[PDB]
Amino acid sequence: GVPINVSCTGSPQCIKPCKDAGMRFGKCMNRKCHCTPK
Numbered sequence: 001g002v003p004i005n006v007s008c009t010g011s012p013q014c015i016k017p018c019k020d021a022g023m024r025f026g027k028c029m030n031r032k033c034h035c036t037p038k
Contacts, residue, residue: 006033 006017006028014026014033023035 001034001036004033004035007031008033 002023004014004017004021006014008014008028008031011026011028014028014035016026017033018024018026018035021035022038024038025036027034027036
């Protein structure tokens with residue numbers, strides 16, 4: 001959806017950074033967060 005620059009180890013890392021910016025979910029690809037916009 002909207003790519004945010006947040007370095008991941010797995011998918012649970014992006015849930016709080018996506019919510020605090022202004023989005024619903026945080027699904028992380030290989031080392032990089034991808035938020036689902038609200």
